[PDB]
Design a protein around this ligand. Sequence first.
Ligand code: Z80
Ligand code: Z80
Lengths: 159, 159
Amino acid sequence: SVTQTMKGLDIQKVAGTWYSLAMAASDISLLDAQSAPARVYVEELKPTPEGDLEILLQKWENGECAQKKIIAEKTKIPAVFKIDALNENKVLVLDTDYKKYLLLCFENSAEQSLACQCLVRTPEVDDEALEKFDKALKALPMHIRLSFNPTQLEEQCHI
Amino acid sequence: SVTQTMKGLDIQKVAGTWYSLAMAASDISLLDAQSAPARVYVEELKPTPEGDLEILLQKWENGECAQKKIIAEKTKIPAVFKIDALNENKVLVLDTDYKKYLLLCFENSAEQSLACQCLVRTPEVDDEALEKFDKALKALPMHIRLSFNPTQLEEQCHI
Ligand SMILES: CN(C)CCCN1c2ccccc2Sc2ccc(Cl)cc21
Ligand SMILES: CN(C)CCCN1c2ccccc2Sc2ccc(Cl)cc21
């Protein structure tokens, strides 16, 4: 369970282009296949004026790379947003420098499905951002991790 | 490319029961699906009197958990065995204490497919054996890692 958040977060400053450089999850089944439920590739983060967080992403669904937009609503905690659905889902922002890397996790309640990503601003392998990611995950019950190469990061659905 | 071998290896002492507690590989495609080519679950290591290494394992193939045996022949290097096939495949033993953990890698030539496992003697999560595994992998170009839980380790094909 995630007890690492970004103190002092300014969300407006996370807007723009992102790349899902690596991903990790609590169960193998969340990331194993091409259409696994947590295999989501972030494209853009779009904070709303009201301080909500629109997420633009790609997902492989029935043989193809589909585009999706979801909205995570603000909460009392600056680093935590809620996607109301069949479940209470939370987006947690763990850490960021705004200009290079952002670590975030998604979690529901059930047991608890948890997936986290290291997002970066450019199609480049950032070893320092990846160290910070592994550091964060040491405290979490993860059983699968994937990372993409720069070629893949320029393809839809990282193919 | 693997430049970590077990100095002083006595193979005869690796015989018996093993469990594939974690696995890592150079390409996502080698481990991603249930029937991915490197998704192999070790059952037993059986050194031959002549110093070859028989490997008993399970593999999910066309909807089912199949049993297989393969033979890796000795070489001039005690820690390196060869499986002659369509490719020159090597089994490399990186480290072991014989009684708890064994790290090993499999590699071919092409680019180079590489997969490594942390094997343990019991259906138990060995954090020290897993630290040694991550340490070993730091030097290798891995892009997917999986680890199993004790329930899974007692099921065929870790289902
Ligand atoms: C789009 N939908 C298939 C998944 C949305 C919810 N979602 C999520 C929620 C709870 C646990 C794990 C995940 S994976 C994930 C990765 C990226 C994003 Cl942006 C959202 C999620
Ligand atoms: C049985 N066959 C599907 C795979 C045999 C060769 N094999 C292998 C070789 C070169 C690169 C990667 C691998 S994965 C693997 C994992 C365990 C074992 Cl024991 C062997 C292998």
